[PDB]
């Protein structure tokens, strides 16, 4: 669970980096499909499963809008992300292991883009938060 310390840290980092959400999202999904190509199995309905491709840029926007949603709902991620959980559960059938993969890629992207801001203390709290987001996304699966 997230302490008040963790919640403040996530809020202060997102206050600093949130304006860059769309770029974070394209960078992170690009890294996921290149570095973990087995994740491309969910995007088989797309022909343009390539870094930086229009479906990847578009979709990175939606994912980091989801992260912004989660920051706004950080006091109750389960309730806050229930609709996205149901979307990934029933429609998308995404195995929750891949949330762990994307979360690592989001941390690599923020490190490349905001090295000063992504301190070790910001990192332990943001890792806890993204683990909480992955668990909340799995809420409606089973």
């Amino acid at each position: 669970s997230l302490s008040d310390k963790d919640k403040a840290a996530v809020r202060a980092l997102w206050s600093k980096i949130g304006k860059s959400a769309d770029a974070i999202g394209n960078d992170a999904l690009s890294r996921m499909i290149v570095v973990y190509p087995q994740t491309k199995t969910y995007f088989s309905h797309w022909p343009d499963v390539t870094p930086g491709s229009p479906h990847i840029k578009a979709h990175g926007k939606k994912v980091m809008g989801g992260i912004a949603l989660a920051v706004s709902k950080i006091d109750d991620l389960k309730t806050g992300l229930m609709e996205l959980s149901e979307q990934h559960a029933y429609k998308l059938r995404v195995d929750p292991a891949n949330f762990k993969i994307l979360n690592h890629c989001i941390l690599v992207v923020i490190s490349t883009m905001f090295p000063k801001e992504f301190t070790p203390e910001a990192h332990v709290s943001l890792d806890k938060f993204l683990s909480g987001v992955a668990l909340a996304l799995a809420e409606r699966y089973r």
Partner: protein, 146 residues
């Protein structure tokens, strides 16, 4: 992978005694219940929104037997598993779009169903050997994903 004679003997012994039309349906049904995102590849099998619906589902059952017999070629090729499954890996990737993490999940369900059938005979060492074999096949099944 380097196999000990004792691991080869355990694997041989489990597969010579396996009831495939029992274990197959149970392992796949249990996977679709415990890990329901694996239902991604089965939509037209009928309605699988229910545990009874799934365990009843004769499409699921037939597929569980087919996938369990997919293990036979590795039992017969224990030092050449990567190459033996290369074609099946390419199929699951480029034709079926199966997330290979699901191969690990079904493996765990096969292990758990086998353990319930073998009972006290599923010793720690037997579990080691059997999970070692499934782990080498699961890796092979994921190898050709690109």
């Amino acid at each position: 992978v380097e196999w000990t004679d004792k691991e080869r003997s355990i694997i041989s012994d489990i597969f010579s005694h396996m009831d495939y039309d029992d274990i197959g349906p149970k392992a796949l049904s249990r996977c679709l219940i415990v890990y329901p995102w694996t239902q991604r590849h089965f939509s037209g099998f009928g309605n699988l929104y229910n545990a009874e619906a799934i365990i009843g589902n004769a499409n699921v059952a037939a597929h569980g037997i087919k996938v369990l017999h997919g293990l036979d070629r590795g039992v017969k090729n224990m030092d050449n598993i990567a190459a033996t499954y290369a074609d099946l890996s390419t199929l699951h990737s480029e034709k079926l779009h199966v997330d290979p993490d699901n191969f690990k999940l079904l493996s765990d369900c096969i292990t758990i169903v086998l353990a319930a059938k073998m009972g006290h005979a599923f010793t720690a060492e037997t579990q080691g050997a059997f999970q070692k074999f499934l782990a080498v096949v699961v890796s092979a099944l994921g190898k050709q994903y690109h």
